[PDB]
Design a protein around this nucleic acid. Structure first.
Ligand SMILES: Nc1ccn([C@H]2C[C@H](O)[C@@H](COP(=O)(O)NP(=O)(O)OP(=O)(O)O)O2)c(=O)n1
Ligand SMILES: [Mg+2]
Ligand SMILES: [Mg+2]
Length: 347
DNA sequence: CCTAGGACCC
DNA sequence: CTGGGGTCCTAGG
């Protein structure tokens, strides 16, 4: 038997869901985000189709910028319920292959497989791609390795509509001259810190003296960085259901708020909304966090623990408005948010 | 034991 | 000009 980890990731997810209702747009630039109006201020791209990506459009880009770069794009509004339904379909199908399946957010999953000699993980990945497309109308790509971190890196090579195997046989030859942010969990700030140590590539990091890393990053994290660079990772695929730690809602206002009354009212509303959604899922609140962003884009969050976990609406609102009260509120307000941290122990 | 917030990801 | 929704860990009262 040979043990594999497969990492499945939906291609251009939100665009691919829209394309199933608009098959005439396959092969054309499609941009999903806001209300489908590319001139609307304070709205951004949530997904650009691969064709729009060749024009430099990417998630986060303001729609008016996207329209400037990609004049021949069809702009569609965001349809969150269709996306949540398509997510559910795909994972339902993936679970029914009879392998341990670990869903990771919305559009991806890790699958564990122990394969007899007669089979090949590439042909299994093929079948996954086939079943998802036949039953859902959606394309996925599949990375293959022997650990989750490496399989995820493989997926980035597998894109679009494809499959890629990355193992001890080829890890360092493919990855060795890549910057450390090619690794999963490393980003630009860790990369900058590494560079000031003389480490500029995956290969450099993989042969770094462990005591250089543990002094700079801590005794666990430094060893973990060395492991990631060597292409190692997590090997167990858990089917245990994911328990969310928190839920949040923010809103960027079409115009900046200048009246306290309105700020209070928005926070009250966001608390109430978030609370009802966590109650409907059976959850209890532990902490209440409020975020404020000024017209200058100066952004801060403050948090306060309840005296005991609760779902009491008046308590939770009073706490959010007391947290909001801590902010200066001297400048116009562009954004307000509430996050509810959730009890993890019993349910 | 608590909050602030950096860093990284979809 | 610059969206929305998350997780984890550390720095420091
Ligand atoms: N900055 C971001 C990144 C992702 N997302 C949403 C929309 C994406 O289609 C979806 C999935 O993330 P993704 O898998 O990183 N990318 P996407 O599926 O569009 O493309 P590929 O995975 O084919 O490259 O999360 C977002 O709303 N804001
Ligand atoms: Mg994807
Ligand atoms: Mg993804």
């Amino acid at each position: 038997m040979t043990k594999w980890v497969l990492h499945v990731d939906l291609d251009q997810f939100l665009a691919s869901v829209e394309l199933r209702r608009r098959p005439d747009l396959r092969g054309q630039p499609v941009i999903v985000g806001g209300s489908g109006d590319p001139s609307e201020p304070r709205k951004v791209v949530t997904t650009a189709s691969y064709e729009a990506r060749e024009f430099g459009v990417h998630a986060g880009m303001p729609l008016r910028a996207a329209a400037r770069r990609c004049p021949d794009a069809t702009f569609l509004p965001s349809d969150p319920a269709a996306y949540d339904e398509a997510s559910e379909q795909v994972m339902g199908l993936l679970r029914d292959l009879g392998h341990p399946l670990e869903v990771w957010g919305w559009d991806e999953a890790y699958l564990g497989a122990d394969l007899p000699d007669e089979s090949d993980p590439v042909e299994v990945a093929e079948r996954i791609r086939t079943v998802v497309a036949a039953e859902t109308g959606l394309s996925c790509s599949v990375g293959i390795s022997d650990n989750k971190q490496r399989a995820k890196v493989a997926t980035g090579f597998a894109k679009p509509a494809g499959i890629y195997v990355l193992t001890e046989a080829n890890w360092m030859t493919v990855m060795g001259d890549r910057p450390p942010d090619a690794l999963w969990g490393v980003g630009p700030k860790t990369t900058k810190k590494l560079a000031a140590m003389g480490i500029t590539t995956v290969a450099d990091l993989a042969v770094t003296d462990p005591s250089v890393l543990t002094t700079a990053f801590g005794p666990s994290t430094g060893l973990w960085l060395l492991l990631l660079a060597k292409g190692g990772g997590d090997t167990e695929v858990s089917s245990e259901p994911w328990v969310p730690r928190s839920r949040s809602h923010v809103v960027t206002f079409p115009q900046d708020l200048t009246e306290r009354r309105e700020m209070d009212s928005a926070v009250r509303d966001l608390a109430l909304q978030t609370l009802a959604e966590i109650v409907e899922q059976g959850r209890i609140v532990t902490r209440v966090a409020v975020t404020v962003r000024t017209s200058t884009f100066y952004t801060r969050t403050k948090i306060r623990k309840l005296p005991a976990p609760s779902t009491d609406a008046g308590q939770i609102v009073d706490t959010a408005l007391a947290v909001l009260d801590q902010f200066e509120l001297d400048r116009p307000v562009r954004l307000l948010g509430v996050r509810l941290e959730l009890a993890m122990d019993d349910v």
